[PDB]
Amino acid sequence: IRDVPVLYHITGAISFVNEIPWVIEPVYISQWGSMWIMMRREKRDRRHFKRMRFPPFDDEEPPLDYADNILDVEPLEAIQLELDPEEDAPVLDWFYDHQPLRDSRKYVNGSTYQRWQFTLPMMSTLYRLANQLLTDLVDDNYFYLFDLKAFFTSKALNMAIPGGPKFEPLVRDWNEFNDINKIIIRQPIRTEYKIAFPYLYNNLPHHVHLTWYHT
Amino acid sequence: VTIHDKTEINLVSFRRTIYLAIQSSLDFEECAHKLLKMEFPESQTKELCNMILDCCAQQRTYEKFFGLLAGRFCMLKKEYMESFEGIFKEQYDTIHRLETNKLRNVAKMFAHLLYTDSLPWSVLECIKLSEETTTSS
Amino acid sequence: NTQELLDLLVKCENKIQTRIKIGLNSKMPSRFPPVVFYTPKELGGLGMLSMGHVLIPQSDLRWSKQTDVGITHFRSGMSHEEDQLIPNLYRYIQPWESEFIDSQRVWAEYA
């Protein structure tokens, strides 16, 4: 259940939910990472998962009445995951609240909920919970020819990288160099080469960004 | 049970598929590409040569497509060279059954192979050109 | 031998099929499989003949505007929902060189 502030017209004509969903980025990612862990365990361990049916109500059932139908009813346990009080001590008490530490002036700015401050035991537990939604690399050398400037140059030259996107060409006579009897062909020049060294393997480079990194 | 099929439907369907590849391609290289892009057991390279042969023979008049296609296969691996020397052997020995148009088309096919040197010039061993030893066909 | 013609043929065949779809009121690829376009008219189809289902050869714009490198790549023509291997008009038409040779020979032996 979530309770939200409402701003409503004096005659029932309209009602606006009057707030913005502010969240703490590592908390939020950790909560969805635990969601992902649990939902995989369930899709694995259920015998027959029955997906509900759409639309949920008839075409002629007027929309339900909250007071009659949903007001008193108990709300039916959610997808929370079972934290172990040994390792997850820093987190056990506020992990699944709506706005986790909204009222603790030691960890958040205040009640308008900007500016969080955490300790490293917290941050390490959060990291460990979010471990499955995250990337397991430490540096940039993975995105060598797959970063932005590589894709900007690829786009500006209308050539494609093996796993990269394609776009429309940015814009759309005789020559004496090109004489093939004069060429020494040892290894075929590929698009990786033309992109790595866009000023040496390229005629008419316009709006070409210069990729290089050896980080 | 272990039903033992002898409808001979795998070969019939092999031939059907090869012929639709040939009659759907445009040049012998696009055809060779679709062929070496389908995959099959090596039990059927014999069938590959003999079938591309018969494909050639049943047509109305020659065009170098079928010769060059078999040529590409034999120029890729040897088994086609083997099977084509055998092919000339048996085709010649049982040629008397062809009406003169298909006989002519077989003759042209072998002429093309020989002058492209996809067959060894040895294969002329078979024509023991006595008068008795040779039918009019 | 005119790789610009093959391009034209793919595009033009596809435009006329697209207009039959447009004439109905949908372009959804599965409502109009090939069978409904290519079936002979004796079976109720439209009886199209096809040249736009071939693989178009490609090789190396750079070297190709110079010396006729050959073929290295094959781009597709039109889309068959699975292999389906639609035949060509070109394989049922006979070349001119062989026609001229057949003719010389046929008339000689007719004499």
Binding site: M159, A160 | - | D7, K11, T18, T72, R75
Partner: peptide
């Protein structure tokens, strides 16, 4: 690797624009 092949956009071709290599290359 786009080596001078395929449509710079497979828009107006009437195809999907897939490119494979000549498998019968040698």
């Amino acid at each position: 690797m786009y080596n001078g092949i395929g449509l710079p956009t497979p828009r107006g071709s009437g195809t999907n624009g897939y490119v494979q290599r000549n498998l019968s290359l040698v």
